[PDB]
Point group: D2
Chain length 218, copies 4
């Protein structure tokens, strides 16, 4: 643990639009980056109460808090103190598309995340605008190195009220601000849960567990 | 000439991000909405000079200026004084994705466009980040009515330095802020040209002709 | 005219599967290749009556019959006597995907088309498996040259029983068996209609008009 | 199981086209379906030697041989003796698309798979047509139940000569011929290796390990 300590905090500054509805979110997080354990408390500071499912914003709120084994190079941790950015495409099965960008920096024991969110083409009577989602299923991100960048692909799914799933494909590109040692073909398994919230989701608490691994069957 | 005069002006206020790079643009436009003729002058007011091709921003700068025949209901012109919004997904062939949203309002002789642009996953050595584009080919947008909205689909192509094309698919959803009479299955043909610009594209002048038509062979 | 006469006939031999259902189709066509006019009679010779909409097969039944203006090089007509192949991807909006391959040859006054059709992921309760489709809308194919091949893109739409449309994107790649003169950026406008059929569509008659043109607004 | 023995054999009958090139393959396999272990020997019986990478055909040659834990319902094994079908879409990153349909039947101690393969838009100078691929990376299929069907999504990757990866997205739909008990959200991890072959790949031997699991981090 050189630049990154065993216990870290972070601040999230997020702004964006969903179907043209502008919002701003602030967050205070903490966790153990080498254990892949992480918690964050969010406040909708502008544009609340949000007329869409919180769930679409939950995964935009922290890659340095991923447990990497010693034999897999940790792309994101290596990028610091210079830091990194990530770019995300979200393709929902009902036609909705989101583009998300992050800048991640470090100041002592604290990370700072600046996030821009742009989501549109959510059907007015769909699960997002009608708030019929009930959290993300645990996921597994396929990761590989290309052009000095780390590229992640994930088949995500939201649980629906009354049963069934609402599918979303993630493509996330991680861009270190300096050359780092590139990892081999691997996966990061994740569990993201909303552990607390108020009645209109203007305050939300989230927990995440992220562990990197080599292929299970090899 | 209902609420829209034979000769109109407009202001464009655009902001957003391309591969994390923040920018703001202001535009001054004028044209003849019933003739489908249009011109606009853009200034990059923040984040200039832009490290990407201006061409990706040019079609974000005016649907009320489309020549519609009398026998094809004009969705966008009908929307006023209330106005409308549009939501656009741009899918480039090398993986880049943009999501664009607009709010279009009217005050007397002047339209106001508020535009939010989010673009990412442009390859660093690609035509956009290397500024190798030389304008859009004339285009043909396929339009049809669904759920009180007008949906447009367009196979766009950027001309490349040294020859060849760089392809982009446009999907634009137009949403009137009141119910209007819906058109049948039709097309809008466009020609968008940069008619003047300075060396780093921090000042740009654009021309556009837009004409609606029924299928050519029917 | 070189090897292609002003009045020509053709034979279609098509086989394939839709959701695993095997079929064979034989066709006798005739038309005026320089006028872009043609008609064809189809017989389902194996696997009939088909448990799916005929419409998905109708555009697989003749590119040499496209009216090209003198100033636009006719990629397909130039390919003969050697001939050409085409490869098509059809992406339906409800998730269905088709891949289609053709080989086109010439023998005197007759063209022979050998077609392989592969379609799957048509929802059992969707418009295709429930035969709720009512013909294709007139279309406009965007065509350009790349790598000695002609690439076509089309926003197709099927009319639905009870109103509304069922969308499909076409991507067709035309591959001449010899180097030919490559055309510029252009369009082909088409009208495809089922003009006759029996009660279970085991016999179908089709009419197609196809005319190439340069961009309307230029 | 009373229908599926702890030691099984199978036969594969595959035919299809890649970029218009017709081929036929016959295979003889054996394995332990409750252990998720299997092997198969393939012969190119028609159209050989193949002018494309064998790797695109390797995953088309056996779902009943997946190791399922007792607490996760085995969709495919339950479908027998009636059997099941599968439909697969393959989307390669360079624009190539394949559609594959299978019918799986049982006859005492032997499965029979009938497979139709349709692959096209492989670039002539690409890794597949230039035979520059070096096997699939071990994979992880995301599986969920919808409409009595099992839907699998997989981020696959072919290893490249000289290094790097060539990406392919799999979507596979498994359709039982009778209603069965539906599993929850789960994963199947796989390793597929070519273990033997002749000089022109007209004979190929393959090994596959397949193990189902609940989410690693949950």
């Amino acid at each position: 643990m050189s630049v990154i300590a065993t216990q870290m905090t972070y601040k999230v500054y997020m702004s964006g639009t969903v179907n043209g509805h502008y919002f701003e979110v602030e967050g205070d997080g903490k966790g153990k980056p080498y254990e892949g354990e992480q918690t964050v408390k969010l406040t909708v500071t502008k544009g609340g109460p949000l007329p869409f499912a919180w769930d679409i914003l939950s995964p935009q709120c922290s890659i340095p808090f991923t447990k990497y084994p010693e034999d897999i190079p940790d792309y994101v941790k290596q990028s610091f103190p210079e830091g990194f950015t990530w770019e995300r495409i979200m393709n929902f099965e009902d036609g909705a598309v989101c583009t998300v960008s992050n800048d991640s920096s470090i100041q002592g024991n604290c990370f700072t995340y600046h996030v821009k969110f742009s989501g549109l083409n959510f059907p007015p009577n769909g699960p997002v605008m009608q708030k019929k989602t009930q959290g993300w299923e645990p996921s597994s991100e396929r990761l590989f190195a290309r052009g000095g960048m780390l590229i992640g692909n994930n088949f995500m799914a939201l649980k629906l009220e009354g049963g069934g799933h609402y599918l979303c494909e993630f493509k996330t590109t991680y861009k270190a601000k300096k050359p780092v040692k590139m990892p081999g073909y691997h996966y990061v398994d994740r569990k993201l849960d909303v552990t607390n919230h108020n009645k209109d989701y203007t305050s939300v608490e989230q927990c995440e567990i992220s562990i990197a691994r080599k292929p299970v069957v090899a």
